[PDB]
C-alpha cells in the first residue's frame, strides 16, 4: 500500500503548489494595479 | 475549491486573457449527463481547440519579442561602450591641454632667464606676471570640466547573528540577546491555553517587567479568555521596552495538520502585529523544543509562513523580523533556510 | 626633452609650442629687446588662440556627450523594463497552461466516476500531444530572459568584515567547486586523502589530484605536526591546494598547534599572493577536537594573523561548512570577531 | 507549419535582410530565400506582418530608486513563480507516469 | 571668444528656438542672446563648430578594465600638473 500512500502524497504536494501559485499570481497583479 | 481559486485568478487579469481559461460550466453540463457523453467529451476538444489557439498566438508574439529585444540589448551595450571610450578620451585630451600650457610656460621661463644673462637686464619676473594673466594659464575651467567629466563616468561605472534582505523588502535577522531588553515594537511570547508565564521567554518577561506586566497578562486572559490552539492575543508592553506582546498557543508536535497550525500560529502573530501597526517584531524558537517539533521543520515552516504572509499582504507595515536564538544547531539550521527565501 | 615631448602628439599640437628659434635671435642680440619682446608676445597670443579654441571644442564635446548618455541611459531603463515585461507575459502563459490542464484533469476525474467510463489516462495523453502544455521552448525563451537580465542587473551564509578590511564568510557549497584561490586540505603525515575533504576534493580532480598529491609527498616528505605545503590545484576550479597537518586534541600544546596550523596555511596563501582560501572545518571531529573551542581559534589564529602581517594578501577567508551546528558556531564565534 | 520557433523566425529575419528593410521586404521574396518545408505564403506573410508591427518604436519620436524597486519587485515575484511552475510540472509527470504505469 | 558651458547651454536653447539645428542662421540666434555683447562673427564660427560637431556618422571586461586603467593613469596625471601648477607658482614667489 506504499504506493497509494505516495500517490496521496503527490496530490497533497499539488494542492500546496496550486495555493502557494495564487498566493504569488495575485500579488503580481496587485502590484501591477497599484504601479 | 480549485474553481473558486481558478475564478479569483480571472477576475483580476485583463480580458484578452480570461474567456480563454476553460469555462467552469462544465460542471453544470456534467451534472445533466454514451452519445450526449460523447458530446460532452467534443465539447472538451472544443477547449482544446481554444487553448491551442490562443498559445500559439502568444508564443509566436514571445517568440518574435524576445529576439528584438536581444538585439535592442546588444545595441545598448554597444553604445554604452562608446560614450564612455569617448568620455574618457575626452577626459585625456583636456589632460594633454593642461600639459600642452604647463610644458610652454616651463620653456617660457627658461627663455626668459636665458634672455636676462645675455642681455643682463632683469624682466622674467614681471614677463611672468604678464603671462599669469593670459587665458592659456588660466585653466580652472579645464578643472571644471575634468571633474564633469570624472562625475558622468562614476555615475556610469545585542548581537546581530545573520541577515537576509528579503525579496519582498523586509529584513530577517538572527540576533541573539535577552528578548526582553532587545527594543523590538513586538515580542512574541508562545505559551499554553490559560496563558502560562513559565516559558524560558515568560520567565525573563517577568524579569524584565513588573507587576503590571503579569497583570496585563491577566488581564488579556480575562478578556479573551481561553486561547485557542494557533490562535494568539496582544497585550500592552508595560515595563518593557517593546511596546507590544504577542501571545500564541503554539500546537504540539504529533497533532492533527500541527505543520499547517504553526504555520497559521506564525501568520496570526504577524497579523496581530499589523492590527498595532507595528514595524518590527522578535520570534523566538518556536515549535522545537517544548512542542517536540523537530528543528528543522519548525525552521523552515516558520520561514515559510513569514514569507507566504508578506506575498499575500503587500501593505503590511512590518519591515525587520528579528530571530532571538541561543541553540547553536537552531542558529545554524534557521541561517541556512533563511538564505534560501 | 620638449621635442621629444612634442614628438607623440597631433599636428595642431606641433607648431604651437615655444618656437626655440629665438634662440638664434637671442644670440643676435633696447631696440632688440623690443623686437624679442614682441616676439614673446606672439608667442603668447599663439597659445591664448590655440587654448581657447580647443576649449570651446571640448565644451562643445561635453555638452554632446552628456546629452548622449542620458539618452542611453533611458534606453537601457526602457530595455530592462520591456525585458521584465515579457519575462512576466511569458511566465503567466505558462500559468495558463497549467491551470487549464489542471481543470481539464478535474473534469476528467468527475466525468469518469459519474458516467463510470475510463477516459482519463487516453485523454491525458492526447493533451499531452497538442500545441498548448509543450513549454519545453517557452521555458527556454525564459531562462534566456533570466540570463539577459542578470547581465542587465553557492550561497554565502554569513560574513564578518575584519579591521584591516579582511571578508570572513561561512558560505554553504562543496569546497572542491569553490573557485578560491586556495582551498585547505587537512590531512597527516602521509598526505592521506580519504578524509571527507578528501574524498569531494578526490571526486572532482581525480587523476591530476592524485598525482599533485603523490609529487608533493615526494617533494615533501614526512608532514610534520602543525605544518603545510601547497600543491598545484590540478583539474580543480582553486589555483592551489594547502595541505596540513592539524594536531591531535589533547596532545602537548595542541591550541598553539592550530594556532600555528592556521598561520602556516595563510603564509603559504601569502607567499603565492593569493587573493582567496577557503577553509573546510579543521581539527574538530578527526582530531577530537570539540566543535566550538577549534572555531575560536581558528578565528583568533586569522585575526591575529591579519595584525600581525600587516603585507598580506588575502582579501576573502571562506567557510565551507555543512553541520548545521559547526555553521551555527561558526556565525557565533565570528560575532566575537 | 504555422509553429515560429526561435530558428525558423531567425531564418526568416535574415531573409527579410537580404531583400533589405522589413518595410520594403516582400513575402513572396521571403518565400523564395526560405527553403523551409511546407511554408504557405499565407504563414510567411501573416508572420511579416506580426514582425513589422512589433518592429515599430514610436516612443522614438516625441524617484528612480522607487521604480527600480518595484521592477525588481516584479521581476522577483515572476521568477518565483516560473520555479513553483517546474516544481508543479515535475510532479503531475510523476502522477501521470505513476497512474500509466499502475492504473 | 570665451565660451563657457552656460552661455553654450544658452545658445544651444536659442538654436533650438530659431527653428532646427542645421536650419539656424547666428544672425537670429544673436537677437535670440542679447548679451554680453556677442557679435555675428564669433556666434556664426561657434555654431559652424557645432553643426560639424553634432554629426554622429553611422573578454571585454578585459577592455572595460584597459579602459579603466586609462582613466586612472589619466587622473594621475592630471593631479601631477596640477603639484607642477603649484610647485611653479611657489617658486616664482622664491
Ligand atoms: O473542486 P473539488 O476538488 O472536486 O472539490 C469539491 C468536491 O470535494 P473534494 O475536495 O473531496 O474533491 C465536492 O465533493 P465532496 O467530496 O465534498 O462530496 C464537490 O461536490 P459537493 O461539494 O456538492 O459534494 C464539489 O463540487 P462539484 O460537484 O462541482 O465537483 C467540489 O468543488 P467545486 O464546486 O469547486 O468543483
Ligand atoms: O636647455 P637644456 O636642455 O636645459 O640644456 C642646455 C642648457 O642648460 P640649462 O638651460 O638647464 O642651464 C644650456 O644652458 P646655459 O649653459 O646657457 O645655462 C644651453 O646652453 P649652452 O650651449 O651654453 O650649454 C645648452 O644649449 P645647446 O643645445 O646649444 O648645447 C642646452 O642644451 P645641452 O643639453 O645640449 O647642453
Redesign the interface.
Given at each position: 500500500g506504499n504506493?497509494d500512500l505516495?500517490?496521496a502524497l503527490?496530490?497533497q504536494?499539488?494542492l500546496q503548489?496550486?495555493?502557494?501559485?495564487?498566493?504569488?499570481?495575485?500579488?503580481?497583479?496587485?502590484?501591477?494595479?497599484?504601479? | 475549491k480549485f474553481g473558486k481559486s481558478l475564478s479569483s485568478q480571472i477576475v483580476e487579469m485583463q480580458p484578452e486573457w480570461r474567456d480563454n481559461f476553460l469555462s467552469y460550466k462544465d460542471l453544470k453540463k456534467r451534472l445533466n449527463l454514451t452519445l450526449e457523453q460523447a458530446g460532452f467529451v467534443g465539447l472538451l476538444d472544443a477547449e482544446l481547440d481554444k487553448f491551442n489557439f490562443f498559445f500559439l498566438e502568444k508564443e509566436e508574439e514571445y517568440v518574435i519579442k524576445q529576439k528584438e529585444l536581444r538585439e535592442r540589448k546588444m545595441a545598448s551595450a554597444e553604445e554604452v561602450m562608446r560614450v564612455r571610450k569617448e568620455i574618457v578620451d575626452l577626459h585625456g585630451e583636456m589632460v594633454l591641454l593642461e600639459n600642452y600650457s604647463a610644458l610652454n610656460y616651463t620653456g617660457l621661463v627658461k627663455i626668459l632667464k636665458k634672455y636676462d644673462k645675455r642681455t643682463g637686464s632683469m624682466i622674467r619676473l614681471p614677463f611672468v606676471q604678464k603671462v599669469l594673466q593670459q587665458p592659456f594659464f588660466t585653466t580652472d575651467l579645464l578643472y571644471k570640466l575634468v571633474k564633469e567629466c570624472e562625475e558622468m563616468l562614476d555615475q556610469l561605472m545585542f548581537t546581530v547573528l545573520s541577515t537576509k534582505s528579503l525579496f519582498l523588502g523586509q529584513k530577517l535577522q538572527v540576533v541573539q540577546a535577552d528578548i526582553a531588553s532587545i527594543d523590538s515594537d513586538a515580542v512574541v511570547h508562545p505559551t499554553n491555553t490559560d496563558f502560562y508565564i513559565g516559558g524560558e521567554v515568560g520567565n525573563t518577561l517577568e524579569k524584565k517587567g513588573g507587576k503590571e506586566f503579569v497583570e496585563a497578562v491577566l488581564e488579556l486572559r480575562k478578556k479573551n479568555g481561553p486561547l485557542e490552539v494557533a490562535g494568539a492575543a496582544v497585550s500592552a508592553g508595560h515595563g518593557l521596552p517593546a511596546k507590544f506582546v504577542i501571545h500564541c498557543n503554539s500546537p504540539v508536535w504529533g497533532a492533527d495538520k500541527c505543520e499547517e497550525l504553526l504555520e497559521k500560529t506564525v501568520k496570526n502573530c504577524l497579523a496581530l502585529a499589523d492590527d498595532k501597526k507595528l514595524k518590527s517584531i522578535a520570534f523566538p524558537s518556536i515549535g522545537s523544543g517544548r512542542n517536540g517539533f523537530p528543528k528543522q521543520t519548525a525552521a523552515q515552516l516558520i520561514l515559510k509562513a513569514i514569507s507566504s504572509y508578506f506575498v499575500s499582504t503587500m501593505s503590511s507595515s512590518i519591515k525587520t523580523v528579528y530571530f532571538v536564538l541561543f541553540d547553536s544547531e537552531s542558529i545554524g539550521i534557521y541561517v541556512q533556510e533563511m538564505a534560501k527565501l
Open positions: 504506493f505516495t500517490e503527490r496530490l504536494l499539488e503548489k496550486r495555493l502557494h501559485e495564487q498566493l504569488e499570481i495575485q500579488r503580481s497583479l496587485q502590484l501591477r494595479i497599484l504601479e | -
